[PDB]
């Protein structure tokens, strides 16, 4: 006899249905999530025992859309770019919630079984993974909420439909727990810092009903929590022990950098907390392409090209191994290229001219020749210069930067233009792209609690000045498209 | 502040520009090479430390053409066959220049950023790899030159354009150092031995200006040479210690074979230095194909088929694991199939009838059933018989052979129809394909100095007789296409 445990709740203009304890019973947990007519079957399998010599935590999130979900039969057609991006939209918020030291293999599989053309399955899958990981018993400090925030008629809209996104000046996706925001992925039409930040708070407050309803479902049908504890801290072994290529467990060396930044001492390369690296802006680097640009920000360089033809706006991103001075594979999008490429696309999509004024298919290819701090934001700067070189009449010039944060108690330091080493060690990756008048793209990845409205407001303010500084240098080289 | 080190020089009818020390600074070296409007960005990354239990030298050459280089946007389209062949045209000359014992991981990445429809990027990429490997500091006994040699109006033409190749009776690509020639890859319209050899000397003499200009660029912007030396020769362990399948470190056993050949003693299988293996020529092996042929040269056999349809001349080459009596994968072109397939295609392309006399699409598939010495040249013999079986009116019958050379001081032995074991141990792989009147294809891979005009002239003369012997046996079976 099969017994389905069902909980329904109102979420904006939709009803979210959660079913468990019936389908896929050999999985650690499995939920059928339905937001109106769109449905995603999410499963989580966590291995009971960790492997002997495991150095990292293996988390694999698999997203897959079925053709039968829309009621279609495939023609002449390995996950697509859209499926990989949504898989990362699930992976990013859930990853830092597994306790420090947890090494067991966990796999999340989300498959779309039904889809309404107006309701996007990406939010449905994120709620499904949040429900499954909480019902499983696997140590997971959730549950998380998922909310898409629009901006129609100067007002924030919770989970706007595909038709409502046409009127919206914002496509922000926010994820986080009851305590603090974890992820943020968005695209905007040059909105101010307060408008962008207000959207993060709006979505985080609205997604609380999702967290509350998963919690109650765990109280009713949740499997007993995994009896797990990390290997105890041994003090006997702990207490006993400018250029990136020249400089680069050393947990103590990682601590020294963190303690130096909080004290107010110069950074690893010698810069201050708000200083930007050496800039080099160039236009017309390649003779046979329509537009070419070579943007350099310290030890981060991008060779960006623009091609005109007769999707209307294509963006490609290449990350070769020689950018970091290493020998790897080529052509294979290492769980990065698709993510950073769409990030850089969202930073440029706002200033792109209308098809009525400029009826041409534009493809932008970014080549990362050097990487030492956010090559995705360097691609945003390079794209703007390459489009102006090609003769593409973009509304305004666009630049991007990456921001870092080290927080200790109530003492926090906002870092401008973070390095490769400064990423791994910070508590918050913070990428802002936009023009002199607004923000086109905003990305957040937070791992700590205590991150509030004010701290994020100061972080955006220092990011705005960092953006305006590069835009000033960019204007000195080129300021108008052919 | 970025400072580009630039050196320009005249090369035939073009100006070759070399830029370094600005783009991709975390790579061991990186050059931007431009021959007129065609540009290839070449990077080399060499690892400082060798891996513990490494048995071979890991060299990976990656060639990739960008669609934005020609100013195009991809439609509905993993490197292509053309990209893999050019990658080998870079790999072949550079490989034997790394000192014996060098085991560190080196990767060469060449990406085409701009392309003139008349200037071929393949020569540009070869010069780029020659410039990068010399500027890096990594132990490399170059620099090498790169030259395409044509034959228009009974005269040799340095780097002929795509329009000039239409008039040319030769498409020879030569590579080598200041001292001696290393590689040679060509396609010809039945040119004599002296005409083919003269082209190798012409190209090697013309490419000296490339070597001279890279040398000066190394004198100006070259990184300090890597302080490297191989593990010393230990005499305590060194002095202490017909059928291919039955017969097959043993550096002493490798030396015994080399010393036997130089002395004048019979080869491993019992043949003399100029003798050819047992030949078996057959026609009409398969009942449902248009033309079929089974060619056997000792322990090297090829099942070659021809298909007629209504690129006009397609050539496919399959190398299954059972050909050597081993168990491997199937369908995966192991860094061979594409190379040997185009080699066998170039051997047959000269005798192929005109589209005016014979307006049909012809596909030739070669199946290597046995392999023990140059299955690519056995495919040339098999293709000629399969085309005659299909009824394709080829100008003349075509056969191919592989030649070997052992040189010691001034004493050298030219080997006819080399075995699988005789390849690994020789100093020069030498493949000639053609009819009774000329040479259609000629391939060279030399690893030694002292290789001169006279020695190569004797090597071709013994190769010609070896070719005429097989053609005589081929004529006894079939001599006219249906």
């Amino acid at each position: 006899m099969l017994n389905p445990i069902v909980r329904k709740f109102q979420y904006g203009q939709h009803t979210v249905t959660l079913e468990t304890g019936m389908m896929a019973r050999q999985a650690t947990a499995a939920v059928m999530v339905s937001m109106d007519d769109t449905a995603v079957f999410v499963t989580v399998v966590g291995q009971k025992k960790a492997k002997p010599g495991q150095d990292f935590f293996p988390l694999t999130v698999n997203y897959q859309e079925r053709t039968y979900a829309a009621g279609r039969i495939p023609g002449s057609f390995r996950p697509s770019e859209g499926e990989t991006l949504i898989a990362r939209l699930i992976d990013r918020p859930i990853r830092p919630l597994f306790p420090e030291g947890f090494v067991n293999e966990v796999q999340v599989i989300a498959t779309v079984v039904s889809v309404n053309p107006q309701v996007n399955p990406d939010i449905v899958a994120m709620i499904g993974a949040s429900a499954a990981l909480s019902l499983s018993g696997i140590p997971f400090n959730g549950p998380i909420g998922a909310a898409r925030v629009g901006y129609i008629n100067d007002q924030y809209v919770l989970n706007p439909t595909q038709d409502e996104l046409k009127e919206s000046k914002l496509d922000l996706v926010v994820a986080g727990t009851e305590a603090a925001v974890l992820m943020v992925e968005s695209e905007a039409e040059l909105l101010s810092e307060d408008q962008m930040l207000g959207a993060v708070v709006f979505g985080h407050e609205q997604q609380q009903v999702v967290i509350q309803n998963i919690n109650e479902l765990v109280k009713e049908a949740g499997k007993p929590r995994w009896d797990w504890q990390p290997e105890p801290v041994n003090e006997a072994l702990n207490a006993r022990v400018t250029d990136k290529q020249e400089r680069y467990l050393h947990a103590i060396e990682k601590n020294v950098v963190r303690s130096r930044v909080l004290a107010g001492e110069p950074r690893i390369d010698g810069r201050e907390k708000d200083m930007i690296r050496g800039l080099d802006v160039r236009t017309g680097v390649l003779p046979r392409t329509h537009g070419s640009a070579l943007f350099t920000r310290g030890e981060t360089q991008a060779l960006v090209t623009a091609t005109l033809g007769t999707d209307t706006f294509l963006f490609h991103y290449n990350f070769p191994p020689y950018s970091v001075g290493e020998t790897g594979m080529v052509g294979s999008p290492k769980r990065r290229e698709i993510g950073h490429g769409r990030l850089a696309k969202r930073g440029v999509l706002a200033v792109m001219p209308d098809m009525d004024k400029f009826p041409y298919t534009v493809r932008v290819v970014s080549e990362i020749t050097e990487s030492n701090g956010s090559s995705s934001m360097a691609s945003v700067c390079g794209a703007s210069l390459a489009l102006m070189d090609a003769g593409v009449p973009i509304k305004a010039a666009v630049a991007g930067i990456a921001m870092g944060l080290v927080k200790e108690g109530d003492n926090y330091v906002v870092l401008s233009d973070i390095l490769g080493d400064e990423d791994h060690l910070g508590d918050m990756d913070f990428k802002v792209a936009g023009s002199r008048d607004g923000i086109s793209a905003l990305q957040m990845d937070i791992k700590i609690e205590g991150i509030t409205k004010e701290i994020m407001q100061v972080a955006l303010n220092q990011a705005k000045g960092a953006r305006l500084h590069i835009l000033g240098v960019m204007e000195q080289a080129i300021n108008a498209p052919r | 502040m970025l400072n580009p080190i630039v050196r320009k020089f005249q090369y035939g009818q073009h100006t070759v520009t070399l830029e370094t020390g600005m783009m991709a600074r975390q790579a061991t070296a990186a050059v931007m090479v431009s021959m007129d409007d065609t540009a290839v960005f070449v990077t080399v990354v060499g690892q400082k430390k060798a891996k513990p239990g490494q048995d071979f030298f890991p060299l990976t050459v990656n060639y990739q053409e960008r669609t934005y280089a020609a100013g195009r946007i991809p439609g509905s389209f993993r490197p292509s066959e053309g990209e893999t062949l050019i990658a080998r045209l870079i790999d072949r000359p550079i490989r034997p220049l790394f000192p014996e014992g060098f085991v560190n991981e080196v990767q060469v990445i060449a990406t085409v950023v701009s392309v003139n429809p008349q200037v071929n990027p393949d020569i540009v990429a070869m010069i780029g790899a020659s410039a990068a490997l010399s500027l890096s500091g990594i132990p490399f006994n170059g620099p090498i030159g790169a030259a395409r040699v044509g034959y228009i109006n009974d005269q040799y033409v340095l780097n002929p354009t795509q329009d000039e190749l239409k008039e040319s009776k030769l498409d020879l690509v030569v590579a080598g150092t200041e001292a001696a020639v290393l590689m040679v890859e060509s396609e010809a319209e039945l040119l004599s031995e002296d005409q083919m050899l003269g082209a190798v000397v012409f190209g090697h003499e013309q490419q000296q200006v490339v070597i001279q200009n890279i040398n000066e660029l190394v004198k100006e912007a070259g990184k300090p040479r890597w302080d490297w030396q191989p593990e010393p020769v230990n005499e305590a362990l060194n002095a202490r210690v017909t059928d291919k399948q039955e017969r097959y470190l043993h550096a002493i056993e490798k030396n015994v074979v080399r010393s036997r050949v130089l002395a004048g003693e019979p080869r491993i299988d019992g043949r003399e230095k100029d003798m050819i293996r047992g030949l078996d020529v057959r026609t009409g092996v398969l009942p449902r194909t248009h033309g079929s042929a089974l060619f056997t040269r000792g322990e090297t056999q090829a099942l070659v088929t021809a298909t007629l349809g209504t690129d006009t001349f397609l050539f496919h080459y399959n190398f299954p694991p059972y050909s050597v009596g081993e168990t491997g994968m199937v369908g995966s072109p192991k860094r061979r199939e594409i190379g040997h397939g185009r080699l066998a295609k170039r051997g047959v392309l000269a005798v192929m009838p005109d589209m005016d006399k014979f307006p049909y699409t012809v596909r030739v598939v070669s199946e290597i059933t046995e392999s023990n010495g140059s299955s690519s040249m056995a495919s040339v013999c098999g293709a000629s018989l399969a085309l005659m079986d299909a009824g394709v009116p080829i100008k003349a019958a075509v056969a191919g052979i592989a030649m070997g050379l052992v040189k010691e001081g001034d004493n050298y032995v030219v080997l006819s129809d080399i075995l699988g074991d005789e390849d690994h141990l020789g100093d020069m792989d030498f493949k000639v394909a053609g009819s009774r009147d000329g040479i259609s294809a000629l391939q060279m891979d030399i690893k030694i100095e002292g290789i001169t005009k006279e020695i190569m002239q004797v090597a071709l003369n013994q190769a010609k007789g070896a070719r005429l012997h097989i053609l005589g046996v081929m004529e006894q079976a079939i001599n006219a296409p249906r």
């Binding site: 708000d274 160039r282 680097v285 003779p287 | 701009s114």
Partner: peptide, 21 residues
């Protein structure tokens, strides 16, 4: 004619600087 940083039509550079308030 040629490719690279040297053949650039437009150029602007700045030393590591603290942005304006």
């Amino acid at each position: 004619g040629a490719a690279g940083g040297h053949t650039a039509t437009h150029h602007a550079s700045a030393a590591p600087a603290r942005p304006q308030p």
